[PDB]
């Protein structure tokens, strides 16, 4: 406990300005602001000075300073539940690695088999009941069965609050391993309502936190359903966007590390699902799908979503900017017109580019076709992506299979991995069979038996010696 308690300040820094020269424009009575106005006659936490420099417009490069943070520890939503949650405040420029390291070691988190980065519109809204039901159902199910992290913002608005309701729904059920569904919150420390309540050195392990819906201005509060909360900060209070430059760095760094169980070893796969969203969401969607990281969108209740759901079927280059103009016009209907002509052509470019990559994407088509369940969809999505990745040979079937069994569920592989088109040879499964046993997964064993792996041909001497090295350590 104290180990991490000391470790965090030993490792992390938080930002704060050292240049005290008042802002230009005054805030809501916030005339005591040096362009940031956190708390002082200026934006100062030390001697309210120009940092020995009467140099106006002293940039954050010339104003802000990073120093060990007095804003970590454990927390609890006071007057809301009995469970506790982990939080931490983090500077902007911080190696993604050390965060991952804290997460696994100092927080005791197992390397997960899947990384759902969900996004949408910070706006609040609703959707059809049937769609909402199937969505929350499939999402929480697939997040648990594969042991997947789930990463998003943390404010109490938008689809973040929606999925917060979803995970809380499961924890209301929480049949077993209520800690299964783990969700981490990625928001900006500048936009926090009662944040002072935890600013305390040497750990604030029992950390009460008030909350007040609508009891706040531009600054927001937290959703009250996530499991962990990182807070990014630049040294600025009323500002936005201090999150993405790290979030990208982070999720990318996770798409690289490898897991190795049984005998198999693979790289963690990462797929992102998006909700109603808007323009900026469209920007991020493309900026990801150009990096292999595929996407899945729900056909229903989406401004930037349903438009793509519609254009799903239209072949490329058949999308005129006028089609789009009336589309966005009939869809937005509040900002339907405020779009310059100098951006709608940009949007034609983006959307036509996205639909060009005819594999990394996937419609949902709620109810009518292929709408079996949300999970299986995500599976086929990430799977087809992996398959489309370039290769030399058929070890790609090996890759699909190594995955389908890395995640516990089998239905997938027996459904498609062994359908046809490989003409594999049973002597090309023994590495898998190995990991199938050591991990106590009988179903796959029955499987490869049905596809004829020959025990007598299989259980050789060395392999036998192997299996006797990795018995479950608990056994007498």
């Amino acid at each position: 406990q104290e180990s991490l308690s000391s470790w965090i300040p030993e490792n992390i820094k938080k930002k704060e300005c050292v240049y005290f020269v008042e802002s230009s424009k005054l805030s809501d009575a916030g005339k005591v602001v040096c362009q940031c106005g956190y708390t002082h006659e200026q934006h100062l936490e030390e001697a309210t000075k120009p940092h020995t420099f009467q140099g106006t417009q002293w940039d954050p490069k010339k104003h802000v300073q990073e120093m060990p943070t007095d804003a970590f520890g454990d927390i609890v939503f006071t007057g809301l539940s009995q469970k506790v949650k982990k939080y931490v405040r983090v500077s902007q420029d911080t190696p993604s690695s050390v965060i991952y390291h804290l997460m696994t070691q100092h927080w005791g988190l197992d390397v997960p088999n899947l990384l759902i980065s969900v996004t949408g519109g910070a706006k609040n809204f609703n959707m059809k009941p049937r769609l909402k039901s199937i969505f929350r159902r499939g999402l929480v199910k697939v997040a648990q069965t594969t042991g997947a992290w789930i990463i998003t913002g943390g404010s109490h608005t938008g689809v973040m609050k929606q999925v917060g309701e979803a995970v809380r729904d499961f924890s209301l059920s929480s049949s077993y391993k209520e800690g299964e569904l783990i969700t981490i919150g990625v928001a900006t420390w500048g936009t926090v309502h009662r944040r002072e309540g935890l600013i305390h050195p040497t750990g604030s392990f029992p950390a009460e936190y008030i909350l007040d819906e609508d009891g706040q201005g531009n600054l927001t509060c937290l959703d009250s359903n996530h499991s962990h909360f990182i807070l990014v900060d630049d040294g600025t209070h009323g500002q936005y966007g201090v999150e993405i430059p790290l979030r990208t760095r982070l999720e990318k760094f996770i798409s690289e590390q490898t897991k190795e169980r049984g005998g198999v070893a693979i790289k963690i796969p990462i797929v992102c699902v998006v909700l109603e969203g808007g323009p900026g969401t469209l920007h991020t969607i493309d900026n990801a799908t150009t990096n292999g990281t595929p996407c899945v969108v729900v056909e229903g209740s989406g401004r930037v979503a349903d438009v793509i759901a519609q254009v799903a079927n239209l072949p490329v280059s058949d999308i005129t900017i006028s089609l789009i103009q009336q589309k966005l016009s009939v869809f937005f209907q509040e900002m339907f017109e405020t779009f310059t002509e100098s951006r709608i052509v940009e949007w034609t470019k983006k959307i036509q580019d996205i639909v060009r990559r005819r594999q990394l994407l996937t419609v949902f088509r709620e109810g009518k076709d292929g709408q079996q369940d949300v999970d299986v969809a995500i599976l086929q999505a990430l799977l087809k992506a992996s398959r489309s990745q370039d290769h030399f040979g058929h070890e790609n079937w090996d890759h699909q299979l190594k995955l389908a069994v890395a995640w516990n569920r089998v239905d997938i592989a027996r459904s498609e991995i062994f359908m046809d088109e490989w003409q594999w040879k049973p002597s090309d499964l023994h590495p898998t069979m190995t990991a199938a046993l050591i991990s106590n997964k009988p179903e796959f064993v029955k499987l490869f038996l049905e596809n004829g792996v020959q025990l007598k041909e299989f259980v050789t001497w060395d392999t036998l010696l192997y299996l006797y090295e990795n018995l479950d350590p608990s056994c007498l």
Binding site: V316, S317, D318
Partner: peptide, 19 residues
């Protein structure tokens, strides 16, 4: 019987140029 009737429940409630 139970697994069979559930199936009834489920069914019954369900029903470019070169650039």
């Amino acid at each position: 019987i139970s697994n069979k009737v559930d199936a009834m429940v489920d069914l019954l409630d369900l029903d470019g140029d070169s650039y």
